[PDB]
A paper describes a structure:
The APOBEC3 family of enzymes (A3A-A3H) forms part of the innate immune response against viruses and transposons. The normally antiviral enzyme APOBEC3A is an endogenous mutagen in human cancer. Its single-stranded DNA C-to-U editing activity results in multiple mutagenic outcomes including signature single-base substitution mutations (isolated and clustered), DNA breakage, and larger-scale chromosomal aberrations. Here, we use X-ray crystallography to determine high-resolution structures of wildtype A3A/hairpin-inhibited complexes and demonstrate the underlying mechanism of inhibition.
Surprisingly, they also share very similar conformation of the hairpin loop region’s TT(C/FdZ)G moiety. The superpositions of A3A-E72A in complex with the 3-nt loop, TTC-hairpin (at 2.22 Å resolution), and the 4-nucleotide loops, ATTC-hairpin (at 1.91 Å resolution) and CTTC-hairpin (at 3.15 Å resolution), are mostly similar with an average RMSD of 0.43 Å (ribbon schematics in Fig. 2b and Supplementary Fig. S3c). Larger 4-nt loops extrude one nucleotide to optimally fit around the A3A active site. First, His29 base-stacks with G+1, and T−2 base-stacks with a pyrimidine in the stem (C−3 for the 3-residue loop or C−4 for the 4-residue loop). Second, the positively charged guanidinium moiety of Arg28 forms a cation-π interaction with the nucleobase T−2, thereby further stabilizing T−2 placement for interaction with His29. Arg28 also forms a hydrogen bond to an oxygen atom of the phosphate linking A−3/C−3 to T−2, and the cytosine at position −4 is in register to hydrogen bond with guanine at position +1 as a part of hairpin’s stem. Third, the tight turn between the nucleotide at position +1 and the target cytosine at position 0 is stabilized by a bifurcated hydrogen bond between Nδ1 (amine tautomer) of His29 and O4′ of 2-deoxyribose at +1 and an oxygen atom of the phosphate group that links nucleotides C0 and T−1. Last, the peptide NH group of Lys60 hydrogen bonds to the phosphate linking nucleotides at positions 0 and +1, and the -NH3+ moiety of its side chain forms a salt bridge to the phosphate group linking nts +1 and +2. Our structural studies establish that the stem-loop preconfigures the primary TC recognition motif in optimal position for binding to A3A, such that hairpin DNAs are more reactive substrates and as the 2′-deoxy-5-fluorozebularine derivative is a more potent inhibitor of A3A than linear ssDNA. Both 3- and 4-nt loops present the TC or TTFdZ motif in an identical configuration to A3A.
Residue numbers in the entry: 10 to 196
DNA sequence: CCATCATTCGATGGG
């Protein structure tokens, strides 16, 4: 029902250009005997609650906003689900975000998590430890390529019929990030 | 409250 402005998608998911915000598009699928049935009702997008020192508020990261909304998803404890995130920045360690996602996965063994990041959040000096902790908790940690960007455009954006138009350098940036993520996950 | 930055889950500066 709720779709993202095209300008907001192309300004926030560009994998060579940073913004001072995080968007997270999410999709939930049920895993059956062999198959997976797509649950169109369980998809949407959100962004971080911005830091706001006028109120003494040091923000709430997009990943923790997703954990906040999990109860409202009303996932049946008797079924197994795969959650996919398409997140403009990779999850941080230093605010405790990777830790809470790990705790979530340990507490909810019927939920399998897949994360595709557009960009690596290395402003956090412990960014490697975040990506390794999520992998160690059983999350698939990946870089967004053309296929994931095009899927997010097609699925989450208010395109009004406009096909995905890849930005210059999309493939080159995806490959370079893919190489940085592989070196981090080798250990 | 915006505007800027060729913008790292905002920091500044101007009014
Ligand atoms: O079932 P297929 O023959 O592979 O059709 C695919 C498939 O459609 P769905 O998204 O409806 O399943 C792609 O998604 P995947 O299942 O392969 O992940 C989709 O890509 P988007 O998710 O990017 O929209 C793609 O694109 P489109 O619907 O734009 O044609 C479409 O067709 P093609 O792969 O033949 O282009
Ligand atoms: Cl985070
Ligand atoms: Zn965080």
């Amino acid at each position: 029902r709720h779709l993202m402005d095209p300008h907001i998608f192309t300004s926030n998911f560009n994998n060579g250009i940073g913004r001072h915000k995080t968007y997270l598009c999410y999709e939930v699928e049920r895993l059956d005997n062999g198959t997976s049935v797509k649950m169109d009702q369980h998809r949407g997008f959100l962004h971080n609650q911005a830091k706001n020192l006028l109120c003494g508020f040091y923000g709430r990261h997009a990943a923790l906003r997703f954990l906040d909304l999990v109860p409202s998803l009303q996932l049946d404890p008797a079924q197994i689900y795969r959650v996919t995130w398409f997140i403009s920045w990779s999850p941080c360690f230093s605010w405790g975000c990777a830790g809470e996602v790990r705790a979530f996965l340990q507490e909810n063994t019927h939920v399998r998590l897949r994360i595709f990041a557009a960009r690596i959040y290395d402003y956090d000096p412990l960014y490697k430890e975040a990506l390794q902790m999520l992998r160690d908790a059983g999350a698939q940690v990946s870089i967004m390529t053309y296929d994931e960007f095009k899927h997010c455009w097609d699925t989450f954006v208010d395109h009004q019929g406009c096909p995905f138009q890849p930005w210059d350098g999309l493939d080159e940036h995806s490959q370079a990030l893919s190489g940085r993520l592989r070196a981090i996950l080798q250990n």
